[PDB]
Amino acid sequence: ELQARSRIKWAIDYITKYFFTEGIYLQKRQREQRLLESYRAEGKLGEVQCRLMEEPPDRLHVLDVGSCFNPFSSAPHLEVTALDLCPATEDVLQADFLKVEVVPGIREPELEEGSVRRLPASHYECVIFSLLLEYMPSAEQRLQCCLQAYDLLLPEGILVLITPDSHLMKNWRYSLARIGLLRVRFEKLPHISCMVFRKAISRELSQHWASIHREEGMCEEIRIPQDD
Ligand SMILES: Nc1ncnc2c1ncn2[C@@H]1O[C@H](CSCC[C@H](N)C(=O)O)[C@@H](O)[C@H]1O
């Protein structure tokens, strides 16, 4: 029995609205298509390749990284693959996410010696990093995780990012835009920030947005307060 008003219920509700009950993936699609027209009209971008999602399937492919106990798996039409460095429950796969390869053409996790080594590229409507990134040892490795999430997501799929409290979020927005993830939601919950980043229709589009909004002194990586 999940806690109401938790990060878990927030994410389930957002995922449902984004893919089914509010068609947010289409709203943001139109927004990105307008942004691309504006950039082309200013000569800042040429013809770029766009990749669009098809109508979402009823059962969404969801990857829960750092899952611990698979809280999302009973949520309606989420087909959850849950990974954790130290699984707490038997339905969570053991994996160090930093050592996972993203492989096109496979359709399920591939394990060696009980540890996930390979995950299907461009396969998941949604990737969830709920309180995960602050356990990574470096800002480089936090970015690495999001780069892998990018390769794992279908076009217009979403990376759900939940992180504790203690701006740095402006820099995260810039750094993720640089690699093709545009932020589409930010909400404060008790003691946490809840964010969603979308695999934009075009990586080059997102890259150019990031270029326009780069501020002095902000870095490429994903820092946390305890980087000092
Ligand atoms: N490199 C890594 N690869 C996979 N999981 C990792 C990891 N580093 C830390 N984790 C896991 O990430 C989890 C962070 S606690 C967050 C747990 C859960 N997602 C929640 O919302 O409460 C822990 O279970 C930890 O084991």
From Swiss-Prot:
Disruption phenotype: RNAi-mediated knockdown in the whole organism is embryonic lethal. RNAi-mediated tissue specific knockdown in neuronal tissue, glial cells, motor neurons or muscle cells is embryonic lethal. RNAi-mediated tissue specific knockdown in midgut is viable but results in reduced adult lifespan. RNAi-mediated tissue specific knockdown in eye imaginal discs is viable but results in age-dependent eye dysmorphia with loss of cilia. RNAi-mediated tissue specific knockdown in wing imaginal discs is viable but results in severely deformed wings.
Outcome reported for the amino acid change (mutating Y135A): Reduced binding to S-adenosyl-L-homocysteine
Binding of S-adenosyl-L-methionine, residues: R7, G66, D84, L85, D96, F97, S130
Residues where S-adenosyl-L-homocysteine binds: R7, G66, D84, D96, F97, S130
Alphabetical keyword list: Methyltransferase, S-adenosyl-L-methionine, Transferase
GO biological process: cellular response to amino acid starvation; cellular response to methionine; methylation; negative regulation of TORC1 signaling
GO terms, molecular function: amino acid sensor activity; methyltransferase activity; protein-containing complex binding; S-adenosyl-L-methionine binding
Domain of life: Eukaryota
Protein family according to the UniProt entry: Belongs to the BMT2/SAMTOR family.
Protein name: S-adenosylmethionine sensor upstream of mTORC1
UniProt organism field: Drosophila melanogaster (Fruit fly)
